[PDB]
């Protein structure tokens, strides 16, 4: 229970953002940030504290936290780059000082890195490299500023592991109209199908974390939305 005002948050993207099909919702970023702030992974308490910094739609069952929208400037636009993760079995990793390989003829059985359960996993994921990221939300500007600046949270699939979508220079500006849930009838974030908002059908939990809870039918915006930075700063 705190006075919530519609704010738009714009940050400078530093690394490619990997979208997990559904555009990353700022509510999820804030949920992760609070899970870091409150040393607890229990969804109930983290959600209860998230409602204190974000406006929650009871009738609609979501937080006022728009999905990711790529702020593109006339200098740099939305770019297609691959978030690229490779196992690097260095000579130090491949040495008897670190483990005991099975031996035959006194020779150490080399690890088959070309394939199998012990291969060099070349996991490549799509990622969108825009100069800025933007979200809208009806919440406390102080708490979200503190979280986004100091909590280890990024935009995309794995900021924790892959460090994808690192951001900085988080700038919050007030808005005039709440553009978190709806935008002239176009959902700007995951919402239930019965809400009457159009967009793209999908399956996902309405409330974060988006990897737990029954995946019920939802309507979500385009995964990759781009807007001019000048238009985003207009408010």
């Amino acid at each position: 229970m705190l006075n919530f005002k519609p704010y738009r948050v714009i940050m400078s993207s530093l690394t490619p953002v990997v979208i997990s099909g559904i555009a990353p919702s700022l509510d999820g970023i804030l949920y992760e940030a609070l899970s870091q702030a409150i040393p607890s992974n229990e969804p109930g308490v983290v959600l209860a504290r998230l409602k204190e910094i974000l406006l929650f739609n009871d009738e609609l069952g979501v937080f006022h936290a728009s999905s990711l929208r790529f702020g593109i400037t006339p200098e740099q636009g939305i770019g297609a780059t691959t978030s690229m993760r490779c196992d690097y079995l260095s000579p130090e990793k491949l040495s008897t000082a670190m483990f005991s390989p099975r031996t035959r003829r006194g020779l150490f059985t080399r690890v088959l890195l070309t394939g199998g359960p012990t291969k060099r996993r070349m996991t490549t994921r799509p990622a969108y490299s825009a100069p800025y990221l933007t979200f809208d939300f009806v919440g406390s500007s102080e708490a979200v500023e503190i979280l986004l600046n100091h909590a280890h949270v990024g935009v995309g699939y794995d900021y924790f592991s892959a460090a994808n979508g690192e951001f900085n220079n988080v700038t919050i500006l007030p808005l005039d109209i709440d553009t978190s849930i709806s935008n002239e009838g176009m959902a700007l974030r995951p919402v239930p199908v019965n809400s009457g908002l159009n967009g793209i059908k999908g399956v996902s939990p309405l409330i974060p974390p988006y990897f737990v809870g029954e995946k019920l039918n939802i309507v979500h915006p385009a995964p990759v939305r781009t807007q001019l930075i000048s238009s985003l700063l207009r408010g």
Partner: protein
């Protein structure tokens, strides 16, 4: 449990570079830029994460020690579990997909698999990217050229036998002819590529099955070299690195971590300070860094960062400041009940 955010700066002692397949192109080796060429590169957090995971795994190996036979107790399965979290033998606790706080037993028993995750267990350590703090802090380092030793220092020829001198002359002749052949083949390839940007579908298909055959001709000509497959007098392509003394803002964190897991992380950082190398091109001493990380935590309930201490890695030593950091380190040194063999 506590969330320890290591917010700090990495000052580069010798140029910091990394090879990334997407970033690297035929034009040259470029760092990941998250955009066009006229953008700010970032050192991947994946590379730092893997380096610190390797450091932590070495710390665990040292803590465990060696068997009575002088061989590491870890096998291939356990070694890969601890190094890269790949269950090769198919024997791992398949935690429930929806239960977040799963593996508390495994987390307590294996602090390494707790800090960095395995496949199916979310890691506790989030290693961010090293973002430069300036607009011109990267450059085309390395480069240079491989020079034939006997064409630079004539004295080195006094050691070669006349048979080997003739071998050298044959090598140089083969190199010259291979160069003057491959250059013409590549000129033909360039002309075909120039014709690739005015072609239609049919002639495109005709003139790109030709380019690869020219490449096969290049490979065959290189194979024809009897004395050396590759030209020795090679101009080395430069690699893009961060300049020496680049202040890169680095954001790391550990999430809801027991004091023992944080102690393992600090020990891994201390061990990393022995060889504080990030990235490749170690031949040119690339990767040497000195970093100062203010270790903060979150106040219970309040969204305020408390400063628990500082971690300053420098060539002159590791400076751990803050009592709680020492407490975590000793706690990791204690609790010998860790089980890295299961």
């Amino acid at each position: 449990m506590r969330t320890l955010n290591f917010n700090g700066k990495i000052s580069t002692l010798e140029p910091l570079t990394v090879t990334v397949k997407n970033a690297v192109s035929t034009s040259g080796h470029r760092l990941p830029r998250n955009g066009g060429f006229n953008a700010a590169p970032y050192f991947p957090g994946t590379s730092i994460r893997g380096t610190l995971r390797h450091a932590a795994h070495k710390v665990i190996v040292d803590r465990v020690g060696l068997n009575a036979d002088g061989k590491s107790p870890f096998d291939l399965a356990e070694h890969f579990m601890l190094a890269q979290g790949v269950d090769i033998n198919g024997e791992a606790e398949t935690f429930a997909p929806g239960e977040i706080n799963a593996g508390a037993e495994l987390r307590s028993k294996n602090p390494l698999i707790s800090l960095f995750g395995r496949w199916g267990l979310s890691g506790k350590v989030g290693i961010g990217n090293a973002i430069p703090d300036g607009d011109n802090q990267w450059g085309m380092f390395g480069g240079g050229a491989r020079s034939i030793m006997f064409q630079r220092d004539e004295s080195l020829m006094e050691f070669l036998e006349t048979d080997q001198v003739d071998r050298l002359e044959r090598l140089l002749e083969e190199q010259a002819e291979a160069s003057v052949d491959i250059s013409q083949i590549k000129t033909e390839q360039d002309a075909l590529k120039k014709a690739m940007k005015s072609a239609d579908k049919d002639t495109k298909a005709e003139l790109q099955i030709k380019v690869r055959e020219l490449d096969e001709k290049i490979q065959a000509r290189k194979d024809q070299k009897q004395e050396s497959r590759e030209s020795i007098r090679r101009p080395i392509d430069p690699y893009e690195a961060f300049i020496t003394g680049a202040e890169l803002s680095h954001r790391m964190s550990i999430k809801n971590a027991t004091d023992e897991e944080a102690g393992l992380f600090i020990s891994a950082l201390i061990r990393f300070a022995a060889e504080p190398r990030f990235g490749g091109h170690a031949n040119h001493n690339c990767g040497l860094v000195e970093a100062h990380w203010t270790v903060t935590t979150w106040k219970p309930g309040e969204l305020v960062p408390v400063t628990l201490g500082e971690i300053v890695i420098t060539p002159n030593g590791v400076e751990i400041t803050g009592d709680e950091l020492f407490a975590m380190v000793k706690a990791f040194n204690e609790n010998q009940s860790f089980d890295f063999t299961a």
